[PDB]
Amino acid sequence: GQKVNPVGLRIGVIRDWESKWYAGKDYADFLHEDLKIREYISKRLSDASVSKVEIERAANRVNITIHTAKPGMVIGKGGSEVEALRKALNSLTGKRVHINILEIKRADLDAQLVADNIARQLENRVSFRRAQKQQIQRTMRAGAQGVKTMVSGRLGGADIARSEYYSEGTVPLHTLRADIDYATSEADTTYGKLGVKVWIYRGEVL
RNA sequence: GGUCCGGUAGUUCAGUUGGUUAGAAUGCCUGCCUGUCACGCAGGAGGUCGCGGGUUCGAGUCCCGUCCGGACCGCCA
RNA sequence: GGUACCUAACCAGAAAGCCACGGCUAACUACGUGCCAGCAGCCGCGGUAAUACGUAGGUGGCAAGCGUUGUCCGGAAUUAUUGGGCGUAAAGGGCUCGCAGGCGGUUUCUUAAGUCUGAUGUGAAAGCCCCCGGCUCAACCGGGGAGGGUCAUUGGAAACUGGGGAACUUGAGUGCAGAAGAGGAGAGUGGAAUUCCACGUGUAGCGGUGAAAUGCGUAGAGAUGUGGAGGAACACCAGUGGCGAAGGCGACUCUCUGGUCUGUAACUGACGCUGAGGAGCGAAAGCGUGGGGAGCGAACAGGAUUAGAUACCCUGGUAGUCCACGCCGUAAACGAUGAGUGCUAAGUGUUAGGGGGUUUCCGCCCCUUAGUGCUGCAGCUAACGCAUUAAGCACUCCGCCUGGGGAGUACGGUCGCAAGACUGAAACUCAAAGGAAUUGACGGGGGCCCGCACAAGCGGUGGAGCAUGUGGUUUAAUUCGAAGCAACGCGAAGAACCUUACCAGGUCUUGACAUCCUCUGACAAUCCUAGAGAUAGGACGUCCCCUUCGGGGGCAGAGUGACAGGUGGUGCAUGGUUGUCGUCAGCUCGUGUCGUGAGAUGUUGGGUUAAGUCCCGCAACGAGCGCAACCCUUGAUCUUAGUUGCCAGCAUUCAGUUGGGCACUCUAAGGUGACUGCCGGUGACAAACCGGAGGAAGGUGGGGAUGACGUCAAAUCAUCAUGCCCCUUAUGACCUGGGCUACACACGUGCUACAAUGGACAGAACAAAGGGCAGCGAAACCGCGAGGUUAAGCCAAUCCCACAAAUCUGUUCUCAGUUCGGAUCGCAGUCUGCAACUCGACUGCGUGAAGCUGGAAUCGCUAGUAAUCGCGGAUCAGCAUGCCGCG
């Protein structure tokens, strides 16, 4: 018996859906193509890294906003590449699309980016101890109020798995006023499967 | 070899006398109880009477023989 | 022996292996192996991811050697003099008296046995050690030294241990004056009881246990008043009091008798301590002889309890328990601590004294010995703890111990009449056995507190029928998963086909599905016989965008090898999810302290609440996750908004629809709101608790959401992926049919009843929250019905689903297996779907079953709850007694 997802609980009261469009009688296919474009862009931008992408609807014209500073580097050199990929989104959606790039300053306190960092450090053969203990203090001095991070799977001791987590700070999950951002990521290793769960207390909301 | 006993539920004993009814524990089965088992609590089936023959309206239970065992006797030179 | 050696010439050519690689201990990776094969000195390894098994590469150690075996010494402070211990780990003899033996107060002369030190004589050679010399270092071989006696003669010294002589008094005794005592042995004496007996009175039970029963009583019990008879122990005094060496010793008196302490200083002057063997005592049981026998009471009987009860319990009761004399010689004979001596902080009781200061009054205090307790320094201790009554600091003497079992057994002896006691092996076997403390768990342990946990109530479950799930059986298959709470109307929010995996049959192979390679260029669909896939072929019958035209882009088709497929296994390889204890109140860390260490503190103690909630102390001070709140929703109201709602006043109507208006409800946004806020009391004033008032709501108002660290190798390989295998002419795929619905039985969860607080018929009502565009579907007509016809409005506060039932009123029925119950049946239909036999639902007939309140047992429920009554909704063509939600 495990905990409820914190952002899962906080959606709609202190968090927006990250899909801000109304539909009716088109809800199913709008939703489906939303998942399709999410999957496509996440797959093909994983190397550049991106946390969260919102979708917006107007006159049957989809429009997007995409996060993280690295797609900032995709603006300049990939400015041709931005048009090249959004051509694919046009082809998929049928009707043409608009996009926007928003830069997440201070990436050390984005849950998904942190999770992807941990996943990469794990998959290129670095020890969970070094990776996790370094990342927690990185985020803390980046200026979070509290962090708890956790990894699970066959943690080196391949013959049996276990769980482990570090944390330092204040992190209330039961309070429905905090801004506990949450993410999780999956890391595939030779000796099994590794999963990551990281969340950070940014601050309350008023 | 003779005389006397008996032979019944799967096991042990009543009934076997009352010619006109087949019973009591144990066992076994189902359920409950217990985390499970064992106790324990509810319920339930069974033999149709060693074997064969005969009397009788009716034989388990009366009279015969056959098998089975058990008790007693088998002595005098 | 042409040997050693020297002189030349030829050649990297003839000449490296052994063991280990998890830790001890220096060296690691790949494959096979899968409690097998095997490894080993110990720990131990190996049950498909082995640095520990066998191989391979490399590394590591050593080298003409390297490993194993066997023997001895070290490590072993593990037989300890150097160099150990005996309170609880092994170990103080049960206690005492004492021969031999081991030890010996102070001073003073003397003797030199011990003692210390010279001289001499030897302690062979060769060895080890030192210094040199030589074999081309040395291995070795020499030369010179040194060491090597608990050694013989002799000399020197006298502090100490011995010997002798003379002192001395503190140690040890004697005498003198007191004091105390369950100290011992013998004789006698006395009081209350228990029992028995006789006697008076005396009716109906007495006795006994958790209930009971055996027993005793009308032959007169028990009870109660007398008088006897006896045998055992000595109530309060009585006190961690006293005595004794120990066992042990309590009524009184007497006879005999042991030891101790106090004060002395009159005496002897070291006469002392310890003590193997030896001797004597030595509780209770036990034995022998002779008495005695009240009560108690092994054995034994009877009655209970129990499945059994050879016991625990009850009623009896033999031996013993007692006395005299002998014997045994054991006890947890314990302070689990041998005896003696001296020294080392205190405080505090208490027993027997002595001295002194105020009195030679009492009783006030100060010293002082000897006991006998309790706290507590240093010190010791592994911890407990001991601590002038050492388990501290030291010296003598004795006894005892050296891993656990085997076993205090075996054998042989010495005792004993006997039971048995003392002495006391071994083989074999194990790597632990143990002491104290630490943290959890648990107890038929204690102290608190909580919860529909139990009580106190309601209605249920199993008894019947049926719906559904599960076990078993059954098949060709009855697809798999789930298995106490926490699986079993569960994955399944829907099985005629489809789903669907499974079974039978028929079929395919780069394969429906995905990317790559070459072509054909844009490729398909309709209809025909066999037909189920699919195939034979057909009738138009393979028909785009850009291209300086080369060719590209996408679209399909063909061939093509890489590949795709795994609802195939492994939840004990995992991720990611979920249940459970549990919405229980706990769970932790930072720093600091205490301990030596496991560890503790905070986190305990007072109350407090629901709470680790708060306050108050506290070697703790803080923090974090939990609790609370922040969130949703229902409860009172203010502002804004009045259409598709609402109609207060008006005209109108059957259509409060219209006209008009947001009055009212209602709708949905923003605030108000309840916050212990206020008053009294309780409580320290604190925290809080009780009672009031205001208040729509008073003490987290109600409900929901929220589920800490973690346990259950809890569930899921059916979303996901190393791992192996299945192959791609099969576990991968397409189609037809069957199944998951079977049915001799068992269980779980539910619906319907078993009737008159009812059935049937008629009338009258009141009303949520949701859904509705391959949708909702009005009205009217048709059918007595399930429904059909033609269809208005509604993308919905407008239209529809949609006439909520229970209920109230009235008529009949008159207690029955009934007008209850409606099961199961044959007939005839409706709907959907290509399709209703396996295998739908609904309806009209006919039928009408069991059942008349359900054993033993067992469940939910603290007021809008349970109990009933309906109404929607996900699943979706049809399929709801299930589930979710609403009133």
Could you tell me which residues come within 8 angstroms of residue A91 by beta carbon, excluding any fewer than 6 positions away? none
Give me the amino acid identity at A64.
I
Give the separation between CA A127 and CA A201, rounded to whole angstroms.
Answer: 25
Give me the amino acid identity at A115.
A
Q: Which nucleotides of C are covered by protein (CB under 7 A)?
A: 49, 573-582, 623-632, 705-708, 710-711, 713, 720-722, 773-774, 795
Q: In Å, what is the separation between the CA of A9 and the C1' of C452?
A: 33
Nearest nt by C1' to A174 Cα? C706
| Resolution, angstroms, 1 dp | 3.4
Give the separation between CA A17 and CA A29, rounded to whole angstroms.
Answer: 17
Instruction: Report CA-CA distances (Å) from A204 to A148, A177, A179.
Output: 17, 6, 6
- Give the bridge partners for A110, in sequence order: none
Nearest nt by C1' to A191 Cα? C722
Nearest nt by C1' to A177 Cα? C630
